[PDB]
């Protein structure tokens, strides 16, 4: 239907399109680490979007695409944000900037 054998699209938060609107009634402002994906219009310039709370700040969150896989998320060849879900599930990701650094070990996993 929509890329079956490709991309993780199984990292909980990567449920796969949760309906924008829903995203409003899904993580209106629950808590950080409440990753989630919805995807929509923004397809060309974006991997599969994403919704998360920047510690209650809320920015927008969204994944990009580069070489088939994600983008901003190190466009080297990383299309699995699960290895970290276990490998790095606490420590922050404020590498070059606190773009996210809000955790992601607590995916909405479709309430």
């Amino acid at each position: 239907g929509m890329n079956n054998n490709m991309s993780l699209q199984d990292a909980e938060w990567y449920w796969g399109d949760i309906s924008r609107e829903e995203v409003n009634e899904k993580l209106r402002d629950t808590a950080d680490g409440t990753f989630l994906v919805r995807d929509a219009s923004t397809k060309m310039h974006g991997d599969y979007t994403l919704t998360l709370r920047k510690g209650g700040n809320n920015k927008s969150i969204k994944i990009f695409h580069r070489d088939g896989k994600y983008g901003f998320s190190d466009p080297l060849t990383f299309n699995s944000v699960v290895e970290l879900i276990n490998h790095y599930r606490n420590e922050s990701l404020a590498q070059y900037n606190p773009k996210l650094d809000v955790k992601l070990l607590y995916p909405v996993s479709k309430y």
Partner: peptide
């Protein structure tokens, strides 16, 4: 808001 922001990168812990 909760629009769309390009950024992520494996947690890779702090730095």
């Amino acid at each position: 808001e909760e629009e769309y922001m390009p950024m992520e990168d494996l947690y890779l812990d702090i730095l």
